[PDB]
Amino acid sequence: ATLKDQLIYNLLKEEQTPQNKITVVGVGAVGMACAISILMKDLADELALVDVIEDKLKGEMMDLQHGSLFLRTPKIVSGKDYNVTANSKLVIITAGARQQEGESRLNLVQRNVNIFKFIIPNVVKYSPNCKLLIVSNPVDILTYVAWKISGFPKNRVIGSGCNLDSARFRYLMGERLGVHPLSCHGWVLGEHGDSSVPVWSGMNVAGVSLKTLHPDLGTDKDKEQWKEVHKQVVESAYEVIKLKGYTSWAIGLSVADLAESIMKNLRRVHPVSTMIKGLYGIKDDVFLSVPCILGQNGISDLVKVTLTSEEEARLKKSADTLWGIQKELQF
Amino acid sequence: ATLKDQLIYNLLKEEQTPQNKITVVGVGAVGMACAISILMKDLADELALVDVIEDKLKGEMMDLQHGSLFLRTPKIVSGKDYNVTANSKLVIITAGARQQEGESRLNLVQRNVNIFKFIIPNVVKYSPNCKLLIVSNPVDILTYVAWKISGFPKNRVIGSGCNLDSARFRYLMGERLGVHPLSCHGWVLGEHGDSSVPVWSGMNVAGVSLKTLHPDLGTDKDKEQWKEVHKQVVESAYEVIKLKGYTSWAIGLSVADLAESIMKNLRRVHPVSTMIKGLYGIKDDVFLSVPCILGQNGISDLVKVTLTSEEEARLKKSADTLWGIQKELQF
Amino acid sequence: ATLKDQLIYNLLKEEQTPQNKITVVGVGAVGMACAISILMKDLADELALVDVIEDKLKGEMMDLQHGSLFLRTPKIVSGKDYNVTANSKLVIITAGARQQEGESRLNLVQRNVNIFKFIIPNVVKYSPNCKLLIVSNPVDILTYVAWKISGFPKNRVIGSGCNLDSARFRYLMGERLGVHPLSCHGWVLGEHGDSSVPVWSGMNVAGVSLKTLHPDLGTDKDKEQWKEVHKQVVESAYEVIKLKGYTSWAIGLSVADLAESIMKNLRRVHPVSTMIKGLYGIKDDVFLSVPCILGQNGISDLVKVTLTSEEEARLKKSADTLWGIQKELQF
Amino acid sequence: ATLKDQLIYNLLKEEQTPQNKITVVGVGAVGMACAISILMKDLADELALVDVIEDKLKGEMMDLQHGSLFLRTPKIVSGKDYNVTANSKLVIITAGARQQEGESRLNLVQRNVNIFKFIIPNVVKYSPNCKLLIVSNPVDILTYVAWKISGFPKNRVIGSGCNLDSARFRYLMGERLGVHPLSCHGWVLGEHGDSSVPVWSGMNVAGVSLKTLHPDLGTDKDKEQWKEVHKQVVESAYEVIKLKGYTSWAIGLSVADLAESIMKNLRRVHPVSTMIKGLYGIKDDVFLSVPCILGQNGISDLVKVTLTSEEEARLKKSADTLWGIQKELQF
Ligand SMILES: NC(=O)C1=CN([C@@H]2O[C@H](COP(=O)(O)OP(=O)(O)OC[C@H]3O[C@@H](n4cnc5c(N)ncnc54)[C@H](O)[C@@H]3O)[C@@H](O)[C@H]2O)C=CC1
Ligand SMILES: NC(=O)C1=CN([C@@H]2O[C@H](COP(=O)(O)OP(=O)(O)OC[C@H]3O[C@@H](n4cnc5c(N)ncnc54)[C@H](O)[C@@H]3O)[C@@H](O)[C@H]2O)C=CC1
Ligand SMILES: NC(=O)C1=CN([C@@H]2O[C@H](COP(=O)(O)OP(=O)(O)OC[C@H]3O[C@@H](n4cnc5c(N)ncnc54)[C@H](O)[C@@H]3O)[C@@H](O)[C@H]2O)C=CC1
Ligand SMILES: NC(=O)C1=CN([C@@H]2O[C@H](COP(=O)(O)OP(=O)(O)OC[C@H]3O[C@@H](n4cnc5c(N)ncnc54)[C@H](O)[C@@H]3O)[C@@H](O)[C@H]2O)C=CC1
Ligand SMILES: C[C@@H](Nc1nc(-c2cc(C(=O)O)ccc2Cl)cnc1N)c1ccccc1
Ligand SMILES: C[C@@H](Nc1nc(-c2cc(C(=O)O)ccc2Cl)cnc1N)c1ccccc1
Ligand SMILES: C[C@@H](Nc1nc(-c2cc(C(=O)O)ccc2Cl)cnc1N)c1ccccc1
């Protein structure tokens, strides 16, 4: 018969659902960085890609497939239709609209809502029990949107939030101190971006509180002006975009780290965006980054960080701002 | 009194020469895909990037650095000046000229020669003992060019050659047979590109020769048209390019596999481009792909594959054409 | 409020179940080598250990647990009671008597069959959908036994078989040829023991057939005496046993290689113990190694190897021997 | 000619001095667990094993070699003679004599000193520039002994010290809090074993000080008796030994973590034993664990942990006791 039949004797036809499937939505520079990082970390037995640009999507899929000999992820699929995402444990959303020349923040956000109004229901239809990880900006608002639209419980809706901000901060800290970032601990929480909060009290190496050692740490009287470190962090995306036109590698690595905790049920703690209603005097339905325990069911727990008055007020202001935009959104 | 001094006591300041450093020249889609794959495989204790476009170059470096928390490569550097590449064990070249429409092969190769006359002597100045891995196309000729300009012994100048072609072949084979590419064995040799040779006699699973089971394999009488697999291999770059505009991931993965053998001294066998004078019947100084043993000295040995009359003729034809061009090059 | 409660706000409780649980029965030298290999390969989110020596069991569990900071497997349990193994995707059996210096694995049948009569029903009780991977000796005989007792379909009952014999063969081959064993291909089939069969016709590097190059290969008139390489494979366990009293590391690695194909659904080809009825005119329900495609459903396919008349006779000899033993077993 | 020569053409006949070599001295339970952990983390291009029991040594080497197909460490060698250890970057000492019943501290140590008088000079002879990592107990004293005998600068003599104590502590903390050990930070310092010191002020999750939330942490009036955690850490070794007769896996993993930072020049911070004269009122040549920065040159820096009065006196008391023994040793 066929060469395949002469070579191989089959015992079983009945295939099986993929058991550790991940989907990435949006195959732009960010989506694809998440994809490559996920593949090279062996987190999935099946990866699906979705996008609206069909030729691009197919080309990315094929380029990855051609690398299969060097990977341990035996099936890569893609498509415009969401049936290819069926039974994903985790669905990472990087799709969205880039802010345009002259466009306001409310209109920018609405355009992204209008995109999530199509994306989310489709994801939910095919993977009703997945965790949602939102990367698209503005991430805090869009994570809220996906939670609202999906109707998922809060543990299954997760925003990339200040995960990368924190990684950047630890890299900068590491360079200043001559220590690997892995051994430099420090947390950036709150609203992702300009209004994020560097938690000076938790910055440490080997458990040694930097703020205890240098009480001026984080202030203007800070002889070393560590404030600037948080400054470089907030301005990193812009600096990199000005140099290469976009960002990709760091976000991809940082998302892959989140995926690892989730897929392997590690219960590590990560700074990610989560519904914070009921904390720091916040009573609105808003998402902000706090250290969260990540595992098989998403965010099972969050760490209640002790904040100072100034630090609590900043999150409160962020929450207020976020809510004021959200009550204007049309679903 | 500085925070760093309060926190850390320095035992010594000394030495600090990288032990496992890799340089990538050219930070386009291919260079960066090589970079990310090499990082995620923990192959290097230092990565250097070089390019002539300084904006892009700086942005790519920073983007990778921001992901340092998630990597085990503590030092990433870049610059237009080759002093950043000093003491590299392995230098990977992806830079070169893009062919114009209506431009003769000889004309293009000449432009590349002129480019390499700048790049290669600078690489050699700073890492006189490195292995050179050439990825730029046309790879076989450009590997000859690098060998000529560098003055390196044959073992230390390696062309990526048919390495990715063979990986693509194994993927396609795997797809047809329902087996992982790791367990599908097949070799594409000779001149990288449209003139490459699929060695039917060597294709096997678990040491069972497909050609033996199926004597028409690869001929025009093949009812299953396995010849189309090689045709797909040859058309892959073009098909992917047409879809996404370039290729990156598969080449990056393949290059990292080669780097792995070299850096870890594995002595695995890969199909890569090497000085083939004296073998398979060729009398000129030309590089073509054959299976090569790769390790810490680059190519220390090569495998002598038995070819059919036709297969031998095709390699001989390529050598003729390549030499016809090389002999008219101006160094 | 407790410290934990001050520090951590819980979103939801209710334990979930492991997604990728592996059980190892027998925490002896082989069981623990399997355990550490599987842990360091990140194949499981839960590892369960079972043995009849309760203090040794607890101690091995604790020793592993103490290394958790350095692993990615968040839960490790043990117990004499099989409830600790509930919900396992893969159950690896390494319990029972091992052969002493100069003793045949075949001398272990009565002891180990009697042990399997208690083990197997318990495993099936708590993980009715697992794949069974048998390691205890003699492994081909015990795979048949595990199969008969369990009532599983044979795809889900796998003996570690000649995966290790082939690994040893390829190590010895690579040493002779100066090539990494990954690049040296050659298969040892049949009994994991004295009657195993080296398949000279399939041995190759880069698709180049050593038999075609060297027609005496494997015969008695072979001036290079390659048969001695297979003889060394046969005597391997005995040599190691005489030196250090037992074998552990290589089987540990071999088992983990098998577990990776199964757990990640790779569909790689390995020589494992399975029922070969219907091949080479064999009519009995005899188990022994041939190349198999391994995935999430265990053995989905067998590769039909083309044996020479002499190879096939040697394989049928092995089968006769093994069936002579298997057929006399009383269940 | 030979099959090898018919198959393979040679370009050059090597051979390089070892580039990333590690030696393990002593192939007992701890030695081999270090070895397998190092092999599975791909830290070395060459592994050497030394012991005085020749059959045992050879057998361990062979067992490992048989697993070569599954590893990326292409050369594994062993011998009683230290010439096999030449050009090691890192030499790990696990050799020693186990303490006899009713034997004084001094006499046990002196017995290990007699062993080191032979081992260390041999190591130094063949790898004059290596880093020494001392694992044999009592580790702080034997690290001093290796330091004095070797004549090395202090940066190149490292004791595993409280590395494993700290890993256990973090495993126990993770169990109490329902969080992965990776995200549970806490440091055990000073003398390894009975007199080690838990630094309560450094224990934290996500930079949130447990001592600050819970002032009674680690005190006698602690309602949650967190001191019992440190008590478990000290009793752990004894409990495991009592159960399985020895300990191996955890120390093995902890050592490979240190080797990783050293071989890869990561500059992470580990609690390891270092020459601490000049700290905490310590004025004698003694080794005690504090957080050290580990890289290609061994310990290049250490972190100055702020200790309480009692914490300080505990270290000082250990240093007095240690020197009390050291000043009596016959070298
Ligand atoms: N949370 C964080 O820390 C960071 C977030 N980001 C965000 O990642 C997002 C995307 O990044 P880029 O890849 O550079 O943008 P991109 O525009 O290059 O790629 C976006 C992709 O979304 C796709 N898309 C648009 N509408 C879609 C729909 N209805 N269905 C499916 N696909 C659709 C587009 O076709 C496009 O391929 C941005 O919003 C960016 O802000 C970037 C860096 C950091
Ligand atoms: N051998 C193989 O199997 C394959 C080879 N390739 C080759 O990779 C090469 C590059 O691919 P792309 O990254 O997509 O092209 P690219 O043009 O986008 O990237 C090339 C980079 O080289 C830089 N460059 C140019 N001149 C330089 C100089 N004198 N010094 C340093 N840098 C210089 C450019 O600035 C550019 O950033 C192409 O030649 C392509 O054909 C691509 C796929 C497969
Ligand atoms: N398939 C292969 O290539 C290899 C197979 N083996 C086999 O694996 C087996 C194990 O060898 P070792 O681990 O070195 O022996 P071991 O003596 O070190 O450990 C055996 C363990 O089995 C346990 N055990 C006995 N009865 C049990 C029961 N009813 N339930 C649960 N546990 C039970 C023992 O308590 C003991 O801890 C032997 O049969 C050996 O021959 C060994 C090497 C290679
Ligand atoms: N720092 C730490 O946290 C820990 C340290 N250890 C220590 O590791 C050491 C070893 O433990 P085990 O492997 O269980 O002991 P073991 O007795 O089983 O093995 C020790 C090996 O040292 C060898 N040896 C003796 N003299 C030698 C010489 N002159 N040259 C080369 N080798 C020689 C012995 O032959 C023996 O094989 C012990 O001192 C133990 O306390 C163990 C656990 C933790
Ligand atoms: C499409 C979008 N892609 C990206 N956008 C960002 C981005 C991130 C933040 C942020 O992290 O807060 C803020 C603004 C932007 Cl533009 C980062 N990386 C990207 N590939 C983009 C917008 C403007 C210019 C270039 C690219
Ligand atoms: C710059 C070059 N970059 C690449 N070029 C190729 C390429 C490879 C081959 C080949 O390997 O035979 C032949 C032609 C091209 Cl165009 C593959 N991947 C690339 N990123 C490119 C040229 C034209 C169009 C798009 C890109
Ligand atoms: C040979 C030695 N090997 C080991 N010894 C210990 C050990 C460690 C400590 C400690 O860590 O302080 C204290 C006592 C012992 Cl016995 C741990 N693991 C070992 N393989 C041993 C001595 C007595 C009993 C059992 C084993």
Coordinates of N, CA and C in Angstrom, one line a residue, chain A residues 11 45 51 63 79 104 115 124 128 133 142 176 179 212 221 229 232 244 255 261 270 273 295 301 326:
Chain A
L11 N -2.1 1.2 15.9 CA -3.0 0.6 16.9 C -4.2 1.5 17.2
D45 N 1.6 21.9 24.5 CA 1.6 20.8 23.5 C 1.0 21.2 22.2
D51 N -5.4 36.1 14.2 CA -5.3 37.5 13.8 C -6.3 37.7 12.7
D63 N 6.6 29.8 9.5 CA 7.9 30.1 9.9 C 8.3 29.4 11.2
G79 N -5.4 30.7 12.4 CA -6.6 31.0 11.6 C -7.3 32.2 12.0
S104 N -8.2 61.0 20.8 CA -8.3 61.2 22.3 C -8.1 59.8 22.9
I115 N -13.1 46.2 19.6 CA -12.4 45.1 19.1 C -12.5 43.9 20.1
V124 N -14.3 32.9 24.5 CA -15.1 32.3 25.5 C -15.9 31.1 24.9
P128 N -14.3 28.0 27.1 CA -15.1 28.6 28.1 C -14.4 28.5 29.5
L133 N -5.3 36.2 29.7 CA -4.2 37.1 30.0 C -4.1 38.2 29.0
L142 N -8.3 47.6 29.7 CA -8.7 46.5 28.8 C -8.9 45.1 29.5
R176 N 22.9 49.1 38.6 CA 23.4 50.0 39.6 C 24.2 49.3 40.7
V179 N 24.6 43.3 40.5 CA 24.1 42.0 41.0 C 23.0 41.6 39.9
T212 N 15.7 50.9 54.7 CA 16.3 51.0 56.1 C 17.7 51.5 56.0
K221 N 15.2 64.3 48.2 CA 16.4 64.5 49.0 C 17.3 63.2 48.9
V229 N 15.3 56.0 38.6 CA 15.1 54.6 38.2 C 13.7 54.3 37.8
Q232 N 13.1 56.1 34.5 CA 13.5 55.4 33.3 C 12.5 54.2 33.0
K244 N 13.9 51.6 17.9 CA 13.6 50.5 17.0 C 12.2 50.5 16.4
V255 N 5.8 37.8 29.5 CA 4.5 37.1 29.4 C 4.7 35.6 29.5
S261 N 4.1 30.0 35.2 CA 3.5 29.9 36.5 C 2.1 29.3 36.4
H270 N 3.5 37.3 41.2 CA 3.9 38.2 40.1 C 3.1 39.4 40.2
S273 N -2.2 42.8 36.9 CA -3.4 43.5 37.1 C -4.6 42.6 37.5
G295 N -1.4 30.4 39.3 CA -1.4 29.0 39.2 C -2.5 28.5 38.2
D301 N -4.8 34.0 44.9 CA -4.6 34.9 46.1 C -3.9 36.1 45.6
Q326 N -14.2 54.3 32.4 CA -15.0 53.1 32.2 C -16.5 53.3 32.2

